[PDB]
Amino acid sequence: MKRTWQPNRRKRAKTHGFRARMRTPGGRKVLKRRRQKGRWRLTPAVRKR
Amino acid sequence: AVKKFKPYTPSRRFMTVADFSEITKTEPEKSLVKPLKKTGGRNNQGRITVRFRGGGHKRLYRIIDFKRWDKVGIPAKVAAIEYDPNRSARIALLHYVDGEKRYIIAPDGLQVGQQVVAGPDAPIQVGNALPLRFIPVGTVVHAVELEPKKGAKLARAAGTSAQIQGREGDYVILRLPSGELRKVHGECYATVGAVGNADHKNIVLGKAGRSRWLGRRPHVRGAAMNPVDHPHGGGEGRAPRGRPPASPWGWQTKGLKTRKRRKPSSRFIIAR
RNA sequence: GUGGGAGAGGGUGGUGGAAUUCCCGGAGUAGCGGUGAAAUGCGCAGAUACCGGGAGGAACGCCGAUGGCGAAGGCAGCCACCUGGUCCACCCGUGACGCUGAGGCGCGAAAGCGUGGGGAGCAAACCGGAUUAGAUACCCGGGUAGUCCACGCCCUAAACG
RNA sequence: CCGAGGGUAGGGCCCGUGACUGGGGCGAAGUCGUAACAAGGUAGCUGUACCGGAAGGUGCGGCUGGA
RNA sequence: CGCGGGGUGGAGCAGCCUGGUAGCUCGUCGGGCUCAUAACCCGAAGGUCGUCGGUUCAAAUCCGGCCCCCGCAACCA
RNA sequence: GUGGUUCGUGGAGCCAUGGGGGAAUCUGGGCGGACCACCGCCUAAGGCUAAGUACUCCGGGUGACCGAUAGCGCACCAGUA
RNA sequence: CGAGCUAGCCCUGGCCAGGGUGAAGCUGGGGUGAGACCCAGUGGAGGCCCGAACCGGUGGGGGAUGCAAACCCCUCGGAUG
RNA sequence: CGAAUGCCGGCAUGAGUAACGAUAAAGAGGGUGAGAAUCCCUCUCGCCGUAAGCCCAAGGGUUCCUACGCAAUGGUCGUCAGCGUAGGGUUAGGCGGGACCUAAGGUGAAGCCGAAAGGCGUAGCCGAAGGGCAGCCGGUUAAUAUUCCGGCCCUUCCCGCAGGUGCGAUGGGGGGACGCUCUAGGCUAGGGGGACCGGAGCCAUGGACGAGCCCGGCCAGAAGCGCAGGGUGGGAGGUAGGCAAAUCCGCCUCCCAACAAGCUCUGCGUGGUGGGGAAGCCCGUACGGGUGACAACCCCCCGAAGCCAGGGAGCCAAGAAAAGCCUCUAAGCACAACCUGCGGGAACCCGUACCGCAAACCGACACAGGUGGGCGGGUGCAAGAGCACUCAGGCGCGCGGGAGAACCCUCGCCAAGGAACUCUGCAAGUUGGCCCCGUAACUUCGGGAGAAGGGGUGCUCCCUGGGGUGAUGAGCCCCGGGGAGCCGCAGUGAACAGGCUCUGGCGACUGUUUACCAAAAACACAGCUCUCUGCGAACUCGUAAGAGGAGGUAUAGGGAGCGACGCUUGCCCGGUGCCGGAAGGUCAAGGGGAGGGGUGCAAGCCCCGAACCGAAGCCCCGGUGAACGGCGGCCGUAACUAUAACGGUCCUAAGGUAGCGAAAUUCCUUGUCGGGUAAGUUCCGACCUGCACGAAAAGCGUAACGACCGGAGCGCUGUCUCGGCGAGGGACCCGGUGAAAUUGAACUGGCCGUGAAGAUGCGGCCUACCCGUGGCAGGACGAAAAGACCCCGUGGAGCUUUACUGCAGC
RNA sequence: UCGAUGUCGGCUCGUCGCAUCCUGGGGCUGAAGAAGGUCCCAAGGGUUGGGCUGUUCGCCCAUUAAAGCGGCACGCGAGCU
Ligand SMILES: NC[C@@H]1O[C@H](O[C@H]2[C@@H](O)[C@H](O[C@@H]3[C@@H](O)[C@H](N)C[C@H](N)[C@H]3O[C@H]3O[C@H](CO)[C@@H](O)[C@H](O)[C@H]3N)O[C@@H]2CO)[C@H](N)[C@@H](O)[C@@H]1O
Ligand SMILES: [Mg+2]
Ligand SMILES: [Mg+2]
Ligand SMILES: [Mg+2]
Ligand SMILES: [Mg+2]
Ligand SMILES: [Mg+2]
Ligand SMILES: [Mg+2]
Ligand SMILES: [Mg+2]
Ligand SMILES: [Mg+2]
Ligand SMILES: [Mg+2]
Ligand SMILES: [Mg+2]
Ligand SMILES: [Mg+2]
Ligand SMILES: [Mg+2]
Ligand SMILES: [Mg+2]
Ligand SMILES: [Mg+2]
Ligand SMILES: [Mg+2]
Ligand SMILES: [Mg+2]
Ligand SMILES: [Mg+2]
Ligand SMILES: [Mg+2]
Ligand SMILES: [Mg+2]
Ligand SMILES: [Mg+2]
Ligand SMILES: [Mg+2]
Ligand SMILES: [Mg+2]
Ligand SMILES: [Mg+2]
Ligand SMILES: [Mg+2]
Ligand SMILES: [Mg+2]
Ligand SMILES: [Mg+2]
Ligand SMILES: [Mg+2]
Ligand SMILES: [Mg+2]
Ligand SMILES: [Mg+2]
Ligand SMILES: [Mg+2]
Ligand SMILES: [Mg+2]
Ligand SMILES: [Mg+2]
Ligand SMILES: [Mg+2]
Ligand SMILES: [Mg+2]
Ligand SMILES: [Mg+2]
Ligand SMILES: [Mg+2]
Ligand SMILES: [Mg+2]
Ligand SMILES: [Mg+2]
Ligand SMILES: [Mg+2]
Ligand SMILES: [Mg+2]
Ligand SMILES: [Mg+2]
Ligand SMILES: [Mg+2]
Ligand SMILES: [Mg+2]
Ligand SMILES: [Mg+2]
Ligand SMILES: [Mg+2]
Ligand SMILES: [Mg+2]
Ligand SMILES: [Mg+2]
Ligand SMILES: [Mg+2]
Ligand SMILES: [Mg+2]
Ligand SMILES: [Mg+2]
Ligand SMILES: [Mg+2]
Ligand SMILES: [Mg+2]
Ligand SMILES: [Mg+2]
Ligand SMILES: [Mg+2]
Ligand SMILES: [Mg+2]
Ligand SMILES: [Mg+2]
Ligand SMILES: [Mg+2]
Ligand SMILES: [Mg+2]
Ligand SMILES: [Mg+2]
Ligand SMILES: [Mg+2]
Ligand SMILES: [Mg+2]
Ligand SMILES: [Mg+2]
Ligand SMILES: [Mg+2]
Ligand SMILES: [Mg+2]
Ligand SMILES: [Mg+2]
Ligand SMILES: [Mg+2]
Ligand SMILES: [Mg+2]
Ligand SMILES: [Mg+2]
Ligand SMILES: [Mg+2]
Ligand SMILES: [Mg+2]
Ligand SMILES: [Mg+2]
Ligand SMILES: [Mg+2]
Ligand SMILES: [Mg+2]
Ligand SMILES: [Mg+2]
Ligand SMILES: [Mg+2]
Ligand SMILES: [Mg+2]
Ligand SMILES: [Mg+2]
Ligand SMILES: [Mg+2]
Ligand SMILES: [Mg+2]
Ligand SMILES: [Mg+2]
Ligand SMILES: [Mg+2]
Ligand SMILES: [Mg+2]
Ligand SMILES: [Mg+2]
Ligand SMILES: [Mg+2]
Ligand SMILES: [Mg+2]
Ligand SMILES: [Mg+2]
Ligand SMILES: [Mg+2]
Ligand SMILES: [Mg+2]
Ligand SMILES: [Mg+2]
Ligand SMILES: [Mg+2]
Ligand SMILES: [Mg+2]
Ligand SMILES: [Mg+2]
Ligand SMILES: [Mg+2]
Ligand SMILES: [Mg+2]
Ligand SMILES: [Mg+2]
Ligand SMILES: [Mg+2]
Ligand SMILES: [Mg+2]
Ligand SMILES: [Mg+2]
Ligand SMILES: [Mg+2]
Ligand SMILES: [Mg+2]
Ligand SMILES: [Mg+2]
Ligand SMILES: [Mg+2]
Ligand SMILES: [Mg+2]
Ligand SMILES: [Mg+2]
Ligand SMILES: [Mg+2]
Ligand SMILES: [Mg+2]
Ligand SMILES: [Mg+2]
Ligand SMILES: [Mg+2]
Ligand SMILES: [Mg+2]
Ligand SMILES: [Mg+2]
Ligand SMILES: [Mg+2]
Ligand SMILES: [Mg+2]
């Protein structure tokens, strides 16, 4: 039947986006750590135009 | 009135509709004086505070005039009488001679063509509005104010009305659609007559949908759910509450009074 | 036809005071209530009795009658509107247009019923108190529908002269 | 084609029968109480309404076939 | 089988738990009123207290053994 | 009414303080574990101050530390696939 | 950290083949004092009917290291709300 | 280190075993090639065809095209590919999105709140498949085209000249601007026919040179007409309203029209012109190109759900916003500015490849699954997006070859019987569309109803009534009627297409739910009652602000229960709850100091502390049951027995009423009578001795309705007696690829014993050459899951309450 | 035996014991004969279809020579239900 992953570019940047994470105190920390851990990608790689 | 139906479908037998004869060939509302976008929504910021709402026909707000000392002395002619989805009372639209249009909740009687007005002057006739003092003790009246300049608030439901009782200082005793004798200030307007369309209390919704149309989702009894989400809940085949009847949140609901005790509004009240 | 007569005939609208019950204020105490007698009941939390104010519902005292009105049921404070039957005088108009009347049809007390409004008094059911062998009764104290209004039903009667 | 009659399907009236059940009539001396006829010891009778072992009681209106 | 409740004049109930004292309503018997019966009035009678044991000076009453009676439990499989 | 100190309301001070009350300028004030007298000690309601102390992303040195299943998760284009 | 599954609501758009049934209402006819009302014709109502898409998921069989961590065949519910 | 269902790594066992992923289907010829069932081409066959075809959106991100290539990826092969390597390929003022607008929502100056983080938030900003905005048809590449070329046609902008006008706002007013169902008129899309026109071509096999077969007979298109249609009255005075000002709008009054006459604005024809243009035939593809060709390019009929569109009518549940747009004036400006022409110049940023019901997206997979909008031809069946075949177009599902066992799956049929099957007619059958006769109880008058039960259905010929389009006609297309006759076993001849009834339980009804074992009698539902709430309402979320409630106001909103409707819902307020009690009793902090203590020489300073004053709550006084609930026991009596209307008596707060009652409630229990049956632990009707019904945790009924649950009969049947045969997919054998759970090691028989009491393994005896393949499931206490039951642990959670103790709240 | 020995019934398949239901022998019989009663010998084979119940068992219904009773993990769920 229908599954749980229904990709959607908008929803994805809108939710796990970078400006998205900067906006909140908890998300900014999410960035810190990922930066502090090394992670090549701080946030998901949404795309297209 | 109240239209009836032959049983050509169970439900549309007991079903009963209103009679919109009193509706002056109007229907399409009046831009300008209303309508405004009406933000429908069953909960506040986030959560749902009143339960069981949502869904139900889209609606446009008819921005009515609920404080008439706006036009003291300026007479206006009642133009139409139309339907208002936001209330039980039908409403009358009227053109002042000032050239301004505005709606008023329509009183029983008031016919299209009639002239109506407000102010200390104003003749005591259906439609006219005046400060409570200047109104004849005993006359009935609707659309009362509670405090001078704050707008109408009592007897505005379909065909409801309040009767003046006496005077007493800068105050005048009323008798609200509920039976409470209240002391209102003299300077509160109150347009004379009863609200009209009193057949409203007689409409037999009819089916399940009918309720759904007016935006009210099904209502489930506490008795149906479990202990986790309401007092009356569980365990076997039905069961007699098992304690003093209570609400989802738990306070008694078969008798417990609510008005907050030490309210300042107490002293101006006298009844039930 | 013409000109008059009495009437609680009928419908809507409006209104008057008396009484009642209830609330508030007052003053006032030690009992009121009820009965054949009592008790139940009510009452120092302050009754009953009396004054003052207000609320509300119903029913209209004397007039009033062994009276009037109506086809019956029935109809009663008072004001108006809308309206029905009927009596008289005049003998002027039509000119036999009449009597009854299966059916249909309407009207039809009280009780009851439907939806809604109203609720003071009273009052089936009901609860208590006495009476009683026993009382599901006649007496008493509480009391619900109902009694009241609107529309719709009901159609019965010792609807009896 | 018509057609006696037969077959299948469903109806209309009628009669018989049916555990059980509703009142009813009749049946010399059983139980319970007082409803009625004398003001029947609560005038009765009454249409209706509810209640009660039972007569019956009670509200409401009514009638004299009562004061 | 198990839990606890109960056997009292003819009927239905008290009386114990703080042992010595059996009480109430009806019914039954005798007498009255009535023509007579009921009602009502006046008096009177009737109880090995389920039984076999002992506990104490003394048991309806305290304690164990059985005879019926009533109610409650007989769950997980 | 509470927190701090070893102090859990204890004879409960001292130090901070939300609430109510509400002084004084040396013959003034707080303290020395309820209190009071004595004897003393210090001078609240403003602020600044290196140093000796902590840490080790980073540089260097040394190891009765590991030696590729160990040693960092990664000796290797690993916070990757 | 999650409402890209799911639940509910808010905003803005889309979809529902074809056939049944025939409400009110109008029109006329009868009918009365005027009514009620009875007829036709018209009309096109409805959590109305048969039934696709579409939404379900009733019974049975299959499948059970499957085609599939919910599927397949037959059958069946709804389908202008 | 041998153990931890240990950790990691490797290799074994099962096994050449199961499998190789839809029963839509394959055969051959010729190529290419180291190597062909698997690649290319041709012929024949099969499958889809409201898709298995094509157009979009999403998502994916090079998968597109072309060259060379098969190591690996492909469930086999591979010369092939979505795979490897290389290079190439995606063109825009007009399609989409941005230099336009607003929706919910997001953000947020101001303001408010919060220990901090942060929460709120009218202005504005942000936010789109919604509003607005200018491209149609053809030609080209191996791959792009509403993009490039071609032909016609638009749009803003800036600068000019020519001419008009009070010009001018982020501001005023207009409009934009709206539901649902049903719809008319006239068009277009698309489609059927043509004796007419255009075409290579063809007489086959008995007949046909025929008004024969086969093929095709359009597409875009400015202005102007034309046919449809959508919008809109023109004046002139008065003005105190549209938070300034308006000449605008609005309202009042006097005129002239009420018409669309007139102005507009779309659509559709037609239009200068511009294109396109089959079958066949010839070739060479991996494909497309020539010719057919000066191709014709005409006439009917069907006809939308699409266009005219802001059309109409009906209804109730009463149906976004803002810009652009027109108009209005203000500040300013009127040498500006703006409008109409006409020239010339400027017109930016991003998407375009390809897959797109799928081998390219979501499911670890080249997965029988999920996936949103448009088109979706023909015929036939009553209609249709249905069904059967077929256009176009795309496919034969990336293992094959044989065999013809049992057994399984899917399918077909059957003598006689037909439900004897079984927990149950579970399953399968019969029934089946439309037309016409014809239909009971009951009923809330609609329904029950497709009730039941019947008959008709094909084709040919004759006669004959109505429409539509054309003219009042032929034709083409629609509905009909009557009458003769024909062929089969059979005419909705295949495909799609209810078995019927009788009677109980429950629920009134449509609905809803345990995604992934329960779809129900459960939830919901209209409706009935209680109750809270006077509005800064109650209530809910929040520390607050704040909001919701509600831009509501008692005819309304919250909570509770019952659950259409019919007829009804009885008694008890003792206990608990809630409601009413300016008495009294109790009642903390606080007031108050009687009186007492500690130090002081002391004045003083520090404590204890009784009177009495002291809230709510509790107590007590009252009511309240559609509030929490409760609604008895034992003895006796009627003139046959019986039985008890009657009576006695004990304790209640009162002491179950009507109605129903072997029940979804009945233990004893197949209670006992009656009915159905040859027979009835069920079923239906009764009786009542109701373990243990009973009135809004409703009672008793109820027409209609249900994939709900029980009984019965008819019909039909492979359910059964009782099987049998046939079919295809596997199973079997051959070729290719090649798993798995399990596994202390194994050289693993039977019996009677024995053993921790169920032995291949120990004892005795019996049997028994070694190793396989198709099968069966009796055993290995077989596999699977550290039993889900039970107990244990002073283990853990969810739930409850007059358990304790706190807390929010009041 | 709880690091699992799946459990009532039925169905399919059976096998065994005899303390035998039938049939076959036999002794006594209060056994005339026919039919029986009873014990003894003896399992070789046979041991029906139904209605009710989940049912085991019963109860019936129509027959029968008879309508036997038990074990095999209340035999048999890696065989079904
Ligand atoms: N025929 C009388 C009708 O039935 C009823 O009456 C019947 C009964 O009430 C009545 O019973 C009576 C009883 O009332 C009275 N107080 C005592 C008497 N012994 C009984 O008598 C009855 O039984 C006996 C013996 O069997 C018979 O012989 C006698 O005929 C019969 N009446 O007997 C009557 C039948 O005979 C109605 N009450 C009466 O109004 C009505 O008219
Ligand atoms: Mg938020
Ligand atoms: Mg509910
Ligand atoms: Mg539940
Ligand atoms: Mg709870
Ligand atoms: Mg409960
Ligand atoms: Mg229960
Ligand atoms: Mg004369
Ligand atoms: Mg007459
Ligand atoms: Mg009456
Ligand atoms: Mg009433
Ligand atoms: Mg009263
Ligand atoms: Mg009274
Ligand atoms: Mg009385
Ligand atoms: Mg007496
Ligand atoms: Mg009457
Ligand atoms: Mg009668
Ligand atoms: Mg009379
Ligand atoms: Mg009979
Ligand atoms: Mg009969
Ligand atoms: Mg009889
Ligand atoms: Mg008497
Ligand atoms: Mg009497
Ligand atoms: Mg009578
Ligand atoms: Mg009475
Ligand atoms: Mg501390
Ligand atoms: Mg101090
Ligand atoms: Mg010190
Ligand atoms: Mg010091
Ligand atoms: Mg410092
Ligand atoms: Mg390592
Ligand atoms: Mg590592
Ligand atoms: Mg009609
Ligand atoms: Mg319809
Ligand atoms: Mg429907
Ligand atoms: Mg359907
Ligand atoms: Mg070891
Ligand atoms: Mg094997
Ligand atoms: Mg094999
Ligand atoms: Mg195989
Ligand atoms: Mg690539
Ligand atoms: Mg390719
Ligand atoms: Mg390969
Ligand atoms: Mg594969
Ligand atoms: Mg090659
Ligand atoms: Mg914006
Ligand atoms: Mg947009
Ligand atoms: Mg565009
Ligand atoms: Mg392409
Ligand atoms: Mg201007
Ligand atoms: Mg403007
Ligand atoms: Mg504007
Ligand atoms: Mg030939
Ligand atoms: Mg051909
Ligand atoms: Mg053209
Ligand atoms: Mg319209
Ligand atoms: Mg607007
Ligand atoms: Mg804007
Ligand atoms: Mg730019
Ligand atoms: Mg492109
Ligand atoms: Mg493309
Ligand atoms: Mg594949
Ligand atoms: Mg879909
Ligand atoms: Mg189509
Ligand atoms: Mg199809
Ligand atoms: Mg057969
Ligand atoms: Mg046959
Ligand atoms: Mg059977
Ligand atoms: Mg059987
Ligand atoms: Mg059955
Ligand atoms: Mg079936
Ligand atoms: Mg049934
Ligand atoms: Mg049923
Ligand atoms: Mg239902
Ligand atoms: Mg669902
Ligand atoms: Mg489920
Ligand atoms: Mg299911
Ligand atoms: Mg309410
Ligand atoms: Mg909130
Ligand atoms: Mg608010
Ligand atoms: Mg609001
Ligand atoms: Mg319910
Ligand atoms: Mg009750
Ligand atoms: Mg109480
Ligand atoms: Mg009580
Ligand atoms: Mg009480
Ligand atoms: Mg107090
Ligand atoms: Mg029975
Ligand atoms: Mg019971
Ligand atoms: Mg019940
Ligand atoms: Mg109840
Ligand atoms: Mg119910
Ligand atoms: Mg019932
Ligand atoms: Mg349903
Ligand atoms: Mg269902
Ligand atoms: Mg078979
Ligand atoms: Mg085969
Ligand atoms: Mg052994
Ligand atoms: Mg051995
Ligand atoms: Mg085995
Ligand atoms: Mg096997
Ligand atoms: Mg095992
Ligand atoms: Mg374990
Ligand atoms: Mg258990
Ligand atoms: Mg413990
Ligand atoms: Mg175990
Ligand atoms: Mg094991
Ligand atoms: Mg013998
Ligand atoms: Mg056996
Ligand atoms: Mg056993
Ligand atoms: Mg057993
Ligand atoms: Mg067994
Ligand atoms: Mg099994």
CSV table of N, CA and C (backbone and C1' of nucleotides) in Angstrom, one decimal, chain C residues 17 60-65 76-78:
chain,number,residue,atom,x,y,z
C,17,G,P,-56.1,50.1,39.3
C,17,G,O5',-56.3,49.3,40.7
C,17,G,C5',-57.1,49.9,41.7
C,17,G,C4',-58.3,49.1,42.0
C,17,G,C3',-58.1,48.0,43.0
C,17,G,O3',-57.9,48.4,44.3
C,17,G,C1',-59.5,47.3,41.3
C,60,C,P,-65.0,33.8,36.0
C,60,C,O5',-65.4,34.8,37.1
C,60,C,C5',-66.0,36.1,36.9
C,60,C,C4',-65.9,37.0,38.1
C,60,C,C3',-66.8,38.2,38.1
C,60,C,O3',-67.3,38.5,39.4
C,60,C,C1',-64.5,38.8,38.3
C,61,G,P,-68.8,39.0,39.6
C,61,G,O5',-68.9,39.4,41.2
C,61,G,C5',-68.9,38.3,42.1
C,61,G,C4',-68.7,38.8,43.5
C,61,G,C3',-69.8,39.8,44.0
C,61,G,O3',-70.9,39.1,44.6
C,61,G,C1',-67.7,40.8,44.5
C,62,C,P,-72.4,39.1,43.9
C,62,C,O5',-73.0,40.5,44.4
C,62,C,C5',-73.4,40.7,45.7
C,62,C,C4',-73.5,42.2,46.1
C,62,C,C3',-74.4,43.1,45.2
C,62,C,O3',-75.7,43.1,45.7
C,62,C,C1',-72.3,44.1,45.4
C,63,C,P,-76.9,42.4,44.7
C,63,C,O5',-76.8,43.2,43.4
C,63,C,C5',-77.3,44.5,43.3
C,63,C,C4',-76.9,45.2,42.0
C,63,C,C3',-77.5,44.5,40.7
C,63,C,O3',-78.8,44.9,40.4
C,63,C,C1',-75.2,45.0,40.5
C,64,G,P,-79.9,43.8,40.0
C,64,G,O5',-79.5,42.5,40.9
C,64,G,C5',-80.4,41.4,41.0
C,64,G,C4',-79.6,40.1,41.1
C,64,G,C3',-78.6,40.1,42.3
C,64,G,O3',-78.5,38.8,42.8
C,64,G,C1',-77.4,39.8,40.2
C,65,A,P,-79.6,38.3,44.0
C,65,A,O5',-80.9,38.0,43.2
C,65,A,C5',-81.1,36.9,42.4
C,65,A,C4',-82.3,37.0,41.5
C,65,A,C3',-82.4,35.9,40.4
C,65,A,O3',-83.0,34.7,40.9
C,65,A,C1',-82.7,38.0,39.4
C,76,A,P,-68.3,33.8,30.6
C,76,A,O5',-68.8,35.1,31.3
C,76,A,C5',-69.3,36.2,30.5
C,76,A,C4',-69.5,37.4,31.4
C,76,A,C3',-68.5,37.7,32.5
C,76,A,O3',-68.3,39.1,32.6
C,76,A,C1',-70.7,37.6,33.4
C,77,G,P,-66.9,39.7,33.1
C,77,G,O5',-67.3,41.1,33.7
C,77,G,C5',-67.9,41.3,34.9
C,77,G,C4',-67.5,42.5,35.6
C,77,G,C3',-67.3,43.8,34.7
C,77,G,O3',-68.5,44.5,34.6
C,77,G,C1',-65.3,43.4,36.0
C,78,C,P,-69.1,44.8,33.1
C,78,C,O5',-68.1,45.9,32.5
C,78,C,C5',-68.0,47.2,33.2
C,78,C,C4',-66.8,47.9,32.8
C,78,C,C3',-66.7,48.2,31.3
C,78,C,O3',-67.4,49.3,30.9
C,78,C,C1',-64.6,47.3,32.1
